[PDB]
Amino acid sequence: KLPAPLLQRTDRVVYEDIPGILDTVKDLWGSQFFISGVWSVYCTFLLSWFHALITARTRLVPHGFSKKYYFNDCDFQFASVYLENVLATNSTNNIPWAQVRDHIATIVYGGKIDEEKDLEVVAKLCAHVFCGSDNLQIVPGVRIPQPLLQQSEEEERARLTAILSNTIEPADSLSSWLQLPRESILDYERLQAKEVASSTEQLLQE
Amino acid sequence: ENMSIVMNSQDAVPFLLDPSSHMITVISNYYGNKTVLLSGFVKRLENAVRFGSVVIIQDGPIISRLISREFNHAVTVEIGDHEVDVSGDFKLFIHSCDPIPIFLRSRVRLVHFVTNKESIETRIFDI
Amino acid sequence: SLNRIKKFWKEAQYEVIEHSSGLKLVREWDVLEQACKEQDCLDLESKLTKLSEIQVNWVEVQFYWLDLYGILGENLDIQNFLPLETSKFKSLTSEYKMITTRAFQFDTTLKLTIDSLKMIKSSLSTFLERQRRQFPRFYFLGNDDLLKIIGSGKHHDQVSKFMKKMFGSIESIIFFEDSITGVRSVEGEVLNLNEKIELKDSIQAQEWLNILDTEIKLSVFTQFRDCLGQLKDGTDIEVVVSKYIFQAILLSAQVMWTELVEKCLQTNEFSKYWKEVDMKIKGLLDKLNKSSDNVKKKIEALLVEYLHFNNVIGQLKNCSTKEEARLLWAKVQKFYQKNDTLDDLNSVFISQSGYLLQYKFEYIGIPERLIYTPLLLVGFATLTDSLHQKYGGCFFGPAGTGKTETVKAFGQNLGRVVVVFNCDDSFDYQVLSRLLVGITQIGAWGCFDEFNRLDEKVLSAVSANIQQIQNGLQVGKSHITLLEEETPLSPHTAVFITLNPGSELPENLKKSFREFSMKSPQSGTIAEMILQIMGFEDSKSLASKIVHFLELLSSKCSSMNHYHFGLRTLKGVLRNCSPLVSEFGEGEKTVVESLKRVILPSLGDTDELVFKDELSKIFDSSKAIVQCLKDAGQRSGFSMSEEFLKKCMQFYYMQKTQQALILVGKAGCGKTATWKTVIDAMAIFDGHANVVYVIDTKVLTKESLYGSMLKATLEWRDGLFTSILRRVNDDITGTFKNSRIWVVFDSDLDPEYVEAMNSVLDDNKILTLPNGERLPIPPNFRILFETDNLDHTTPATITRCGLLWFSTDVCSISSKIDHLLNKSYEALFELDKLKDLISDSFDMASLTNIFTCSNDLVHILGVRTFNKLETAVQLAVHLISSYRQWFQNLDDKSLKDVITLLIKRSLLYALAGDSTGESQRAFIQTINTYFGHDSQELSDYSTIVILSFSSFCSEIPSVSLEAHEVMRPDIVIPTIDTIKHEKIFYDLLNSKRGIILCGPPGSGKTMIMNNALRNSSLYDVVGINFSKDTTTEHILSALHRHTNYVTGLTLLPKSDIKNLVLFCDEINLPKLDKYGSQNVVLFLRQLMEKQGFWKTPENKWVTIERIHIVGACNPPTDPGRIPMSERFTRHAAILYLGYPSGKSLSQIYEIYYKAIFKLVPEFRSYTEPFARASVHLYNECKARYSTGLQSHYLFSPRELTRLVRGVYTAINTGPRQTLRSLIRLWAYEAWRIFADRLVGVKEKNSFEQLLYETVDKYLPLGNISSTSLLFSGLLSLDFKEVNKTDLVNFIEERFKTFCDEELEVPMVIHESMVDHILRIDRALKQVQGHMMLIGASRTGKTILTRFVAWLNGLKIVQPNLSDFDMILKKAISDCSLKESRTCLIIDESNILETAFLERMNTLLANADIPDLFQGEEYDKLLNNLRNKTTEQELYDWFVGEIAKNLHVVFTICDPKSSAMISSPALFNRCIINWMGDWDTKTMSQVANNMVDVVPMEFTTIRDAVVNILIHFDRNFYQKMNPRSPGYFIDGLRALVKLVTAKYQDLQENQRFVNVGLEKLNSLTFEKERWLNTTKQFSKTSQELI
């Protein structure tokens, strides 16, 4: 709680940064600088998309999750260090997908989670992002191709940035991109409007 | 009219219900060197009585004779546990910041310093 | 001021109270501080500042001289440790001696002394800091421990007992021929170094202890290397178990397991290594079967490790693919060892999830290894992840889910000793900051158990410190600047935090830590592995059944506060299994019997049945001790019961193992009995002698329990607990080496007391004391808590203690009757037949119906049937003993009739003294119906006299006593009910039973008590009136004035023939403490039950032999009364002193009216009608008025006593009266005593017309209304109706005399204030007269009181506790030496403490106060009264003169003293005057006779303006509690003053205008202006009014 006399002799301002998924990925990539190989950069890319997805799903208090959590840059930093350590000593390129999946789900991005179904849906998101097949459909629209053996950091960075720049953020991204049914967000905004209308009815009685 | 009621009280003591601490500042500005503040203390009140200095006390029971003008003329004031000589120019003020015993309330000249919906209506009409 | 200050400064000296010579000490600091704190003024100020400087020097020099004596007087090695340091403290000793000399025989010199003191303090602080720079593990301890360690250098000891502290997990050191060869762990494991530590005389503690820990690191490394080599040589682990210490075998075995598992993981091979692990496990179990204790603990720890290895390999062989194989292997802890690293202690690193950390090679002892569950591995993984990037782990979850011991297990598995700060409010900033700095210096990782419990400022400070440490950790800075020091920082250190939300981590710590959840500890695998390591052949099924049983117990039964069915209870059951394993073997029987021995004592009744049914559902299924218990019970008379036998066997089997046992049950259920008989049987069986101790908790304080530093002398004091602990721990007499000791707290559990008892309770068997006294707890020191409820039992104690629950009473009615009869027989050719007759008297077929038809009635101070039969049988036995003299010479029918009558009366007075009289009658016919009509039937007035039937009406004395005795309140009138009460009270007092008197106020409980005991020559009474705040020194001071000690060990009455009885009043009045308990009542229970107590400054058992306890109290239903717990009331009986019937009132007051007609016997034939009139009016007032209408509507015979007292004093102070005049005077007194607190004048006139009807019914007469009555003695020599005109003339003459003499206050005169001053004069002229003043502010009540005080010639005074008592003493001294009739006034603003109200209550319940007149005061009072003229006669004269020479009148505004008004003793004498608000007539007349001072009529109009003022006043108060008239009065005063000033100003202005017009008489304009002014002047004047 802020002290009483400071908040009165001041101009109180409240902000809301844009919750779009695309701007989070672009901000993460601009904050990023890559420096070790190409597979580490590709895994950092996948991890940044995963962090963007979980940050988008955080705001859905009663349907996307069960309690408003607070992720930040430090959790993504630790996950990035874990990814670069895993793909810095396991140079056989036989990717230990189970190791990174379990360590991200149950330790890095499950450290602050107490409920069980929240961890189950985090594990589902990990399985979706880190399926480790020959193709990846991170959303039903765009694909992130796997790198090849004949690239350095600069060309892979350029190629993945081009994959960012082609697709525009869709209007209904809050259900298709997060893999959530439309009726769920419909009920969420229904409860939002119910709270707003009930509050206005209570204020209208005076 | 608050300050008019304050200055037109030569018999009953006035009350300063001023959590904003503006009344004490304007009173001290008007008075100057004759202002002493309290919150030992009996001794300094007796010294102020003997010297003839106006006293203001914050956070408003042994000042019964002074608040009731129960003076002995031979003019001495029996305050606390010893008689104190009266200079004749002694004045007392009571200040508080909490918006109170019944005996004090029915004796002190109570005034209110509170802004409310009536106050904002008067303010918008005045502007 | 100046003279007193100079005199006390020149009188300053010192007290010779110190030990040996030392420094001459001084006490009473605070009085000196309160006393001490132009040229002459500045000189005095400078002297005061110098004196304050010397005062600060004094307190600092003694506060430091205590430690100076501690470290220099008793030992010189501390001051001789180092050369320059030795010179510095030799100079210190020289300075100390010379300042002692100059203190014996200046101020600036002593300021130079404090300068020297501060620089030597800085020198020693820097010396300690440099010693800790040499060895930062010394910086763990406080300064005193450092001084002890450096003093015992050549002594070479006392570091072996701090050996627990500075290295964590080591108990003691061992050393041969002045050379250390190893250390002994906390478990007790011997260690051997690489080489012995050769020692010299010139040794410092720091250097050889650095050698000690460096070489213990090297030695554990050496044994690990040798064990690794020997295991690489193919040696089986079973042989080499006993060779190497636990750390070595753990590290070597885990490294070998890592190497073998990665070798077999490089291929798809798991069978051979799993078979090898299984063979190792089986061989280790076989060796565990035949091991010694050290071998057993090493083997169980290695079995924990190898069960983990078995689980890991079994998990890995389920890995069908290689990727999940690396998944599973990379997550568990991997133990690698370097090969080419030349550094010995950095050759091993631990790999966990791709990271690595450095082992530090410190000994860990052999603690209970945390069994390896997957969640433990996940916690290790996330802690490794946090630590890898220079961060700190944060843990959060539910309470007791495995956080802090998980961090300690991390420290164990990484080989580090972790310091745990057990968070509590007693922690402060400096010691926690010091331990944090030590953790930074030495690099030892540190956990924080339950971090959220700190206070706000301390949590913020430690958060800042931890943030600085972390910030230094990430940036790699080796010098963090905190605590004003640039302390070194090893990169291997860490900081750990654990907490429980439901708060979370603070944001400053949250930005640099990482969270984790561990909500559900996997109990199934823990139980499975514990059952496997215990040796049971069936681990999985038994563990699953135990988990199912625990969850079903936690779900099905009612969730009691003390219940727990989680993990710690499961581990306690598994630990308790092993002694049952040794007898019953391994199987289901052992665990089911352990469950029957552990969880069964904590269960209830329905929970017990649920547990039994679930035990039958899940699970399928020694008499020498039973015989011993039966023999003990049969010897002591406790006839056993099946429930009682089950409970006693349960308690014995529970105390077989667990040290700390708590007994819980409703009061009076046999807890004391069951542990007494169990421990007697235990002493018979095992042969050890028993010693028991009983201590009451709340009556003693913590200072009297343990002790503290003294406020001035700083001297340690030994409390009771410290005394008994020192006695049982010294064992100088040799008793406590084979004698069993039982410290039992016969009191309810207190949270702030169990907070101190946790230091007793903890596992290390050490206690925390302010003076630094460490005391061990031997195995015979068993602690027992017997309580009555668990309302305040902390859940931290419901599991960590041992709990026994007594849901149902373990005794039957028949067995209790038999035991009580046998005890009464043993309490004493004829005794045998008498015992047989009493045994056959209790025909239980009718007694059962008696109990069933007696428990239904309303029991005031309700007690069950289980605690009144004690009183019943004891009264029956005592009456039989009294009548035993004439029972051998009489026929059997008379004997059976007499014993039947006696038991009938005993049951009637033990089962109906808690209900009304008609309930007693109905009980007596119920008894006569149950026992049949064959025997003698007890009647309401039945009595047996010398030997046949009689009645109470035979012995009643119809005494025609004198007239003046009604002024004396101690005189008693006799009646049948009074004699019955006295007889039963006398029997109860003689029967050695407790007495409690209850009933509505006004029945005369104290009055009948003083009747029964003043006439009693066999006893004495000391009476104490209780207060809201009551202390144990009240009762001690009360008894010391009439009792004496003797050996002390025994407290006896001062007389040798009179059994002294302590009386107390208003037991319900004292308030509860902060935890719902009261100390005085438990003290009384301790006196009345165990006949002994403990002295608070001496801790001695003061046995009581000839003192009984009686008590009179108001019922708890009334306001200001709090109920007592049944524990106190179970020892006593209840006598409902109800309201006597109106016929008894008529008889009592017709003797009173004969006595009052003695003075004027011309109307001696009218005693009865006035008694009937008083009875009728009081009965109608009771049936009409009720306390719902107003708080002070309480009616009693106190009104009638005051009525007859007023009539008597009127007749004494009055002339000859006719019949009509006497009727009128009696009506005047009745209206005064009754119609002064009623609702309104309508109630007064209703009382008047009822009085009319009753008088004309009894005495066959005009208007006798309120205002028509005016009785005074101002205008007549004696009380008679005087004329109002001459009365107001006389009081007007006195008013003008007073205004010309002393004070000319602005007062008025009207008939209302005439009535007020007449009433207050009537009260002041009466002996012991007081009033309340229910009036608003500025109503002139105090002014009228002062007026009447001057009229009566009363001396005038203007009123902390000590000053109040000194003023009282001066006033009573002036009263005794000068007959000073001084009036005293108290307002509500005059009273701020309830002690003044309490002493008013005491002195007005009595006529004086006993405990304020004792010692020197009593001796001087007796001497002075002998100067004015036996102690009793002089004190009676003192009581009479203070009754006739004291008058206090109280002023109240709100009708916090409501309970004081409702207090019967306060209400007894003072007449409550409802001044109220002024009425319309009163305000109109006061306005109309103030307006006449100032002429205003120039335009009637006075009535108009007064009507407007009063109507606006009423409208303001009705559109805006008595209505305050202050607004009206100061409004009219200000109006009068403004009118006077404005009239004078207008007269001057009109005179000036007339002068100007006359001077003026161009002129046309001036004439027009003057004419316009003269024309508008009248309109402006009306507008001006």
Ligand SMILES: Nc1ncnc2c1ncn2[C@@H]1O[C@H](COP(=O)(O)OP(=O)(O)OP(=O)(O)O)[C@@H](O)[C@H]1O
């Ligand atoms: N086997 C028995 N047969 C008959 N009466 C028994 C038996 N065991 C105990 N009693 C009775 O039970 C009574 C219990 O006394 P007490 O009130 O001290 O019990 P408690 O449960 O320890 O309670 P507290 O300590 O609160 O007083 C004994 O005074 C005794 O008369």
Ligand SMILES: Nc1ncnc2c1ncn2[C@@H]1O[C@H](COP(=O)(O)OP(=O)(O)O)[C@@H](O)[C@H]1O
């Ligand atoms: N290997 C283990 N895994 C889980 N719990 C354990 C293990 N070993 C012991 N325990 C028990 O778990 C309990 C956890 O309590 P704890 O969290 O330390 O309480 P607190 O939070 O008050 O410190 C301990 O009492 C301990 O007996």
Ligand SMILES: Nc1ncnc2c1ncn2[C@@H]1O[C@H](COP(=O)(O)OP(=O)(O)O)[C@@H](O)[C@H]1O
């Ligand atoms: N039967 C009676 N005989 C004589 N006096 C009585 C009788 N009943 C009541 N009184 C008078 O009424 C008063 C009762 O007050 P009491 O109940 O003793 O007050 P408290 O309980 O506060 O001491 C006594 O002072 C006593 O003088």
Ligand SMILES: Nc1ncnc2c1ncn2[C@@H]1O[C@H](COP(=O)(O)OP(=O)(O)O)[C@@H](O)[C@H]1O
């Ligand atoms: N009945 C009255 N008649 C005249 N003056 C009054 C009366 N009551 C109060 N006053 C004025 O009020 C002042 C203070 O009264 P105070 O003593 O406070 O009343 P109370 O005794 O009820 O507390 C007095 O100086 C007196 O002049």
